[PDB]
Amino acid sequence: PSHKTFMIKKKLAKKQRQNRPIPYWIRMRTDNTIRYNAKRRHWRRTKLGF
Amino acid sequence: GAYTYVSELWRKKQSDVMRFLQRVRCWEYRQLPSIVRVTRPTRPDKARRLGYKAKQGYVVYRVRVKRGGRKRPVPKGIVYGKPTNQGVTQLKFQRSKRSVAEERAGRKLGGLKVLNSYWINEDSTYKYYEVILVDAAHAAIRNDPRINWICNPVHKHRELRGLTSAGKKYRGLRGKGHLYHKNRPSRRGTWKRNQTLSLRRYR
Amino acid sequence: VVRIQRKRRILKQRLKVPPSLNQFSKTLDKNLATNLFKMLLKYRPEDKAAKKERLLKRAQAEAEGKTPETKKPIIVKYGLKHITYLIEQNKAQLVVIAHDVDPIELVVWLPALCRKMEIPYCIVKGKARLGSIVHKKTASALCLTTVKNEDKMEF
Amino acid sequence: KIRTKVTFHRPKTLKKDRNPKYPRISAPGRNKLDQYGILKYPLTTESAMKKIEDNNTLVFIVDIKADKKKIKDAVKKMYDIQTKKVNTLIRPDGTKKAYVRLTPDYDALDVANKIGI
Amino acid sequence: ARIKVHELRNKTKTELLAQLKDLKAELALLRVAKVTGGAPNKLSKIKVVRLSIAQVLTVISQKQKTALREAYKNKKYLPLDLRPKKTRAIRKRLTKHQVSLKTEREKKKEMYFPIRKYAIKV
RNA sequence: GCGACCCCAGGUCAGGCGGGACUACCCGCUGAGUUUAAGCAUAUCAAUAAGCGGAGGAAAAGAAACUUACAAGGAUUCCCCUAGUAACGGCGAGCGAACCGGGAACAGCCCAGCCUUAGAAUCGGGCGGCUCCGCCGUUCGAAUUGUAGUCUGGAGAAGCGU
RNA sequence: AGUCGAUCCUAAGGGUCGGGGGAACCCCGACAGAUAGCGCGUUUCGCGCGUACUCCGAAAGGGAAUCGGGUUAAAAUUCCU
RNA sequence: AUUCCGUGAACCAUCGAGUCUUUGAACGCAAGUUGCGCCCGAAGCCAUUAGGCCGAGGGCACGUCUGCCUGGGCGUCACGC
Ligand SMILES: [K+]
Ligand SMILES: [K+]
Ligand SMILES: [K+]
Ligand SMILES: [K+]
Ligand SMILES: [K+]
Ligand SMILES: [K+]
Ligand SMILES: [K+]
Ligand SMILES: [K+]
Ligand SMILES: [Mg+2]
Ligand SMILES: [Mg+2]
Ligand SMILES: [Mg+2]
Ligand SMILES: [Mg+2]
Ligand SMILES: [Mg+2]
Ligand SMILES: [Mg+2]
Ligand SMILES: [Mg+2]
Ligand SMILES: [Mg+2]
């Protein structure tokens, strides 16, 4: 809602920061196994459940 | 040379003097909280023979406990099981009242160590004990070789592990031989030893 | 606390007191008690300062004086153990018992022991006063084993 | 003693202020929220530049723990400029942004040029 | 131009504070340059300046703690932060002397009848 | 009104102690039924699972108010045997130790009470020193409603000799 | 965002000291009790009052205070005048 | 970056010095609140044996042990009036 607590807003900010693709240069690292961000979230697919 | 007189008098609990004194003391104790500190023991000689000393770091607390058996605490007295276990009343707690008093003192006074306790008074509804506790952090206690053993970590909460005199009594450890052997080192330890199926390498 | 301490006195008054405890309600008379305590005030044990002074004087005069003989002190005796021992050994000449010892089982038997040993005994008011005699907060009882020559007749 | 009140009240007794033999903490802690820690960096977005040009206002990203008084003091210490008013908000990314409007005596454009934005 | 720790230790408190202030100002300028599309050469200096600030703060803190320890030496009731940490159980332990305490009869027994050195041959 | 004591009250008084966390083993409490009995209620499952607490590097036990009846062993603990035995059991289903004997390891001790009374010889705190896990000096306090010392049944006190 | 709300108040109720129970996790909840403190003058001490919770509990109950005009790609009774 | 023949690189190793945000047994009161209180105080501003503004930073839970200060009650006494 428009009315939200400070703690919930900070948690949402962290969740937004965590919702991004991996840097391209990560794939060039020696002995790299990470292909993409497996923890990507979409607001319509999976709810945060707060 | 006076403690023997006091002990002999306290062995005469049905004498008029003792009855009067105990009646007054029981009335007074009934008016006070269940756990309260006493400045000095009311049974000096018994306290001495149980290890108390009149020096800093020793304290005595009077503890009041309720009398009677242990009613099974199930709602509406309903038991879901076979008739053998359907009993509710006439069941008895495996621990003695003085053990309960020592446990209450120890839990309430978490910063002290329970040493021993003794019976002082009782009415139909309540039984009274005084618990001797030791402040293991005091320098007087820590510098006394006869008692500073209580400061070692292995003796933490003796009362809650049955390591007091009452604990040894209710654990069945006050006797030795054919009438008490199953109690050593402990009843459950003996059961585990007896039930063990030993399968050696070369069978 | 006030209510309980008053009701305890009331209850003790109401109930019947057995003779052994009742004997402690009959203390020494005011004049006799005053005379006895005036006599006792001159047989007090030495205080800490006096004891230290005596010890240092003895140490200083030990080698120089070749350990001169000192007259045996005559002072009142205190402490339940020591008083009971002196009574049992028939060394005490007078036993002073406080009337307000709590627990009272510590001294309730003392009059009987004094009677059996034919030792005159008295019950006086105030364990605190007895303690003040011997530089202590309280004293359960006091004993006199001997008195000075100048005081024998009044004793 | 004469008592006129039936109700007993606990008497007032003297209390003593603490005079510890040793200090629990050896020395006072460091000032974490100093002027450099308060002011992270100026915002150089299009909206921030428009604010600087129009409303004589500087836009800063500030420590979330800083309040308006601390922001004003930090701005004064860092750049020696008075502030007419400070408006603050917490962005959706969790950082604090402050709209610092200077007094007419100070020019926002010159201050921005001195800062290097 | 690089900061040497051994050279910092030879400076006074005021000089260290002045250097810390200068380093903080340089770090703020570098942050401004970073937010204004600064060149990689300026960006690489952020790590160096942060390391210098950390080094100066560490030297100041160590000097202050050494001074406090010296001031509280040969004194009881030290500040809790200056007391030995060890572990809780170790801190609660009886001292060696307290552990070795014994009654008079035990001392007499050990003095009179200690375990003797003997052999069985003849 | 003053003073002594007693009990109790308020202190962000000076200095300390305690709560909580972990689970393989350890100590205390509480406590079933599934199941077996070809049904089932006593029994069995089990003095177990679940539940509530308390320690350590091990815990617990421990120096006989013991075992035995022998030509006697001698704290506690554990292993082998005793033994699927004595016993218990709708004497049904089932259940079930201990002593001797052989090994692993071994270790014994501390108090209360009558017993300084030519003086509490005992202990804590502050302060000042020192070869600072402690010792010394001084000053307050605890303690005679008893701290030190001796004694603990195997003895011991006292006296006399070596 | 001093002016819109939370924030303050108390409702049904919730959480508690002490006390009473409880092997214990815990149960009852101001009911077994030397309440918090509050005013006047001051050498900061004196005087006078003082019925055992000065805690949580409403973005719809109660309640200190803002209006036009303008402005953004996206904010406004909050930005500008 | 590094006198790379050296107080000296390292996404090296190891530990003695140091830093260690909000919480949590969690401790001023609370909590779907970065909400609501009290106390001490470095430096600085002008203010001068006087007090004001600000605030770095730190304190204020409970149960207990020893010691202490301040107190209450004819609870037990004694000396005076
Ligand atoms: K059954
Ligand atoms: K001393
Ligand atoms: K002794
Ligand atoms: K209770
Ligand atoms: K209540
Ligand atoms: K409202
Ligand atoms: K307007
Ligand atoms: K609130
Ligand atoms: Mg059941
Ligand atoms: Mg009241
Ligand atoms: Mg053990
Ligand atoms: Mg066979
Ligand atoms: Mg054997
Ligand atoms: Mg000393
Ligand atoms: Mg309670
Ligand atoms: Mg309110």
Side-chain angles (χ1 to χ4, degrees):
Chain A
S2 285
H3 294 325
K4 57 174 67 61
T5 68
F6 172 82
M7 180 273 294
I8 292 288
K9 172 160 161 190
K10 285 287 283 179
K11 289 194 82 66
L12 291 175
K14 190 187 167 103
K15 288 288 167 158
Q16 287 173 246
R17 184 173 79 251
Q18 283 178 327
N19 207 27
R20 53 152 303 182
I22 56 153
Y24 97 94
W25 60 262
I26 286 281
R27 281 177 272 257
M28 297 339 272
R29 294 178 312 159
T30 299
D31 297 313
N32 172 70
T33 56
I34 296 164
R35 298 161 164 271
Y36 49 82
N37 186 0
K39 296 172 178 173
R40 288 297 296 276
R41 175 193 53 86
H42 190 260
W43 62 275
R44 242 203 181 97
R45 255 213 314 281
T46 300
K47 295 307 196 182
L48 288 162
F50 282 177
Chain B
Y3 295 124
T4 311
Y5 292 97
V6 175
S7 299
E8 289 314 296
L9 186 49
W10 260 85
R11 283 187 183 199
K12 298 283 168 282
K13 278 178 186 74
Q14 286 206 80
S15 64
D16 291 334
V17 167
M18 275 324 276
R19 288 190 65 196
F20 177 86
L21 293 173
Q22 294 290 89
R23 181 144 167 237
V24 172
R25 271 170 208 147
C26 208
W27 163 84
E28 164 140 353
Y29 303 160
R30 257 198 310 276
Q31 319 284 110
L32 290 167
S34 76
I35 299 177
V36 52
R37 175 162 177 180
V38 307
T39 50
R40 74 192 41 91
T42 165
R43 298 186 66 188
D45 52 337
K46 181 64 165 196
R48 321 193 45 72
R49 90 172 43 102
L50 290 178
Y52 165 90
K53 288 292 188 182
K55 65 208 277 164
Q56 283 155 351
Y58 281 85
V59 296
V60 174
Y61 270 75
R62 178 173 71 249
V63 180
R64 175 187 82 228
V65 292
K66 274 267 279 193
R67 296 196 69 185
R70 181 193 194 259
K71 174 173 180 186
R72 169 124 53 210
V74 287
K76 304 180 191 188
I78 300 172
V79 162
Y80 305 98
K82 280 140 195 213
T84 189
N85 300 303
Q86 280 189 2
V88 169
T89 58
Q90 299 202 353
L91 311 176
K92 327 298 212 261
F93 195 27
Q94 292 302 145
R95 287 168 58 221
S96 57
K97 295 299 186 178
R98 100 186 260 209
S99 176
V100 170
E102 295 174 356
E103 144 163 46
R104 297 244 164 94
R107 284 193 203 279
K108 162 61 154 72
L109 313 155
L112 315 168
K113 271 93 162 57
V114 169
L115 187 70
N116 235 306
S117 66
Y118 47 92
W119 183 100
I120 45 166
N121 223 312
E122 83 195 346
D123 60 58
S124 79
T125 297
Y126 296 119
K127 213 170 280 200
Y128 294 88
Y129 307 80
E130 274 155 67
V131 179
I132 302 157
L133 297 101
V134 167
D135 177 87
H138 207 279
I141 303 299
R142 294 170 83 76
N143 295 347
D144 181 13
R146 282 188 189 84
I147 190 61
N148 71 355
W149 59 266
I150 199 89
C151 311
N152 297 319
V154 80
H155 301 288
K156 283 174 191 170
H157 280 305
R158 298 161 75 241
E159 73 296 329
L160 294 178
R161 285 181 291 143
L163 289 170
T164 68
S165 207
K168 292 194 169 278
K169 172 52 176 170
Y170 85 66
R171 283 165 77 212
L173 292 168
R174 294 274 80 148
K176 287 169 190 167
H178 66 289
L179 302 167
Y180 284 92
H181 61 91
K182 287 195 182 196
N183 300 317
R184 277 193 188 71
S186 98
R187 181 261 294 188
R188 270 177 291 262
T190 290
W191 180 85
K192 266 172 225 213
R193 194 188 70 242
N194 283 329
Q195 300 291 292
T196 291
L197 180 64
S198 191
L199 302 179
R200 282 162 274 170
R201 293 189 305 156
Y202 300 101
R203 235 131 65 217
Chain C
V1 65
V2 175
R3 193 206 328 138
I4 284 162
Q5 76 182 12
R6 289 179 191 183
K7 258 143 81 56
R8 187 208 304 130
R9 180 192 83 95
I10 282 157
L11 182 65
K12 276 199 220 147
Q13 276 182 278
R14 298 282 171 284
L15 294 178
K16 278 161 159 30
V17 187
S20 178
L21 289 164
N22 186 44
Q23 79 198 342
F24 279 83
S25 99
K26 289 149 276 171
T27 36
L28 243 187
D29 300 330
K30 192 166 284 298
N31 307 116
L32 254 164
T34 44
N35 297 310
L36 171 66
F37 279 90
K38 156 174 38 43
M39 149 93 63
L40 286 162
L41 286 176
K42 29 182 290 195
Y43 293 112
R44 298 175 71 177
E46 54 176 20
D47 50 31
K48 196 183 71 56
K51 168 162 186 170
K52 210 212 179 319
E53 151 212 299
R54 165 179 71 79
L55 283 168
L56 79 91
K57 246 167 253 182
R58 185 169 64 85
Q60 189 72 40
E62 213 293 315
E64 306 162 12
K66 305 176 186 177
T67 316
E69 291 188 10
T70 308
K71 291 188 176 183
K72 193 196 198 201
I74 298 145
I75 44 177
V76 86
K77 263 67 199 288
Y78 62 98
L80 199 55
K81 300 179 190 168
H82 195 39
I83 288 158
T84 314
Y85 180 64
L86 293 163
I87 293 160
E88 277 163 350
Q89 298 308 284
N90 205 47
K91 302 171 146 223
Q93 276 171 244
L94 173 64
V95 177
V96 188
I97 306 160
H99 91 298
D100 55 349
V101 176
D102 204 44
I104 199 156
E105 288 114 333
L106 283 156
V107 312
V108 72
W109 51 265
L110 246 182
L113 175 59
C114 295
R115 179 89 200 310
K116 185 150 189 64
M117 296 311 260
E118 293 114 317
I119 309 289
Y121 74 93
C122 61
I123 309 185
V124 297
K125 255 159 172 35
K127 57 180 167 183
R129 191 138 88 118
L130 297 199
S132 266
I133 293 280
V134 295
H135 302 108
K136 298 291 187 292
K137 277 177 270 189
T138 56
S140 85
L142 305 174
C143 183
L144 270 171
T145 39
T146 188
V147 294
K148 282 176 147 316
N149 277 313
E150 67 248 20
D151 280 42
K152 284 225 165 108
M153 174 267 132
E154 39 283 52
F155 186 56
Chain D
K1 182 161 178 172
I2 166 162
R3 279 183 179 269
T4 54
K5 284 174 257 194
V6 286
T7 295
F8 182 94
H9 300 279
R10 198 196 69 230
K12 313 302 207 209
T13 56
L14 170 67
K15 305 178 191 181
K16 211 172 287 177
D17 280 333
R18 277 185 175 180
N19 193 31
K21 296 260 187 184
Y22 69 95
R24 271 58 169 165
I25 280 84
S26 63
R30 213 164 21 98
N31 175 31
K32 304 278 192 155
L33 263 180
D34 86 308
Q35 88 246 43
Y36 295 109
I38 288 159
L39 300 179
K40 308 277 190 41
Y41 55 87
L43 196 61
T44 68
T45 61
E46 291 170 18
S47 306
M49 302 343 271
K50 253 181 261 291
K51 290 276 167 55
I52 276 163
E53 182 61 31
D54 282 277
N55 308 135
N56 202 46
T57 291
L58 303 158
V59 182
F60 282 105
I61 300 308
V62 167
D63 198 283
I64 191 166
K65 276 77 132 177
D67 58 19
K68 285 168 178 185
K69 162 94 100 183
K70 274 176 194 92
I71 289 159
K72 190 155 98 67
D73 288 349
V75 160
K76 179 46 147 45
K77 267 182 128 274
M78 197 89 52
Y79 306 121
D80 205 82
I81 59 195
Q82 282 313 131
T83 280
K84 197 193 147 152
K85 71 172 162 83
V86 176
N87 279 352
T88 60
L89 74 90
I90 296 175
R91 300 149 91 196
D93 77 339
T95 54
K96 182 171 274 201
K97 165 163 66 168
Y99 298 104
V100 184
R101 194 206 168 140
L102 303 165
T103 71
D105 309 41
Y106 298 86
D107 195 26
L109 207 45
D110 311 339
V111 165
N113 291 346
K114 274 166 208 23
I115 289 172
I117 66 200
Chain E
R2 190 171 56 87
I3 301 304
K4 262 82 165 300
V5 192
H6 73 89
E7 300 188 297
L8 291 181
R9 315 239 184 208
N10 293 318
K11 283 169 109 175
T12 59
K13 180 73 158 242
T14 311
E15 300 180 359
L16 287 174
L17 284 165
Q19 163 145 48
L20 176 61
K21 228 202 177 292
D22 299 354
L23 295 159
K24 270 173 175 171
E26 178 41 350
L27 178 55
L29 225 66
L30 289 172
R31 277 181 262 138
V32 168
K34 170 187 193 182
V35 152
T36 57
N41 196 9
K42 295 218 78 184
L43 258 57
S44 266
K45 287 273 135 292
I46 288 156
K47 195 192 249 64
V48 181
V49 174
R50 288 194 307 114
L51 167 61
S52 284
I53 289 161
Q55 279 165 337
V56 172
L57 283 169
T58 291
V59 168
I60 290 161
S61 181
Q62 291 173 334
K63 273 185 184 168
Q64 165 204 123
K65 277 281 193 82
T66 281
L68 290 164
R69 304 243 187 209
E70 211 79 29
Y72 276 99
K73 190 182 73 263
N74 285 331
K75 183 177 281 185
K76 97 193 308 310
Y77 298 143
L78 308 200
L80 261 46
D81 66 292
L82 302 186
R83 287 178 194 192
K85 179 62 173 171
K86 306 290 183 178
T87 65
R88 183 184 171 124
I90 286 161
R91 287 206 309 280
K92 299 304 182 299
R93 284 186 192 159
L94 289 163
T95 65
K96 163 183 64 48
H97 167 88
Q98 280 161 341
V99 154
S100 80
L101 285 171
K102 50 173 41 62
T103 69
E104 295 325 289
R105 204 180 303 110
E106 280 149 311
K107 294 178 192 174
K108 288 157 94 169
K109 175 173 180 292
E110 75 176 339
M111 256 185 307
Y112 287 130
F113 301 100
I115 286 134
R116 303 298 304 277
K117 184 195 167 176
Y118 59 88
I120 307 299
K121 185 51 183 167
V122 182

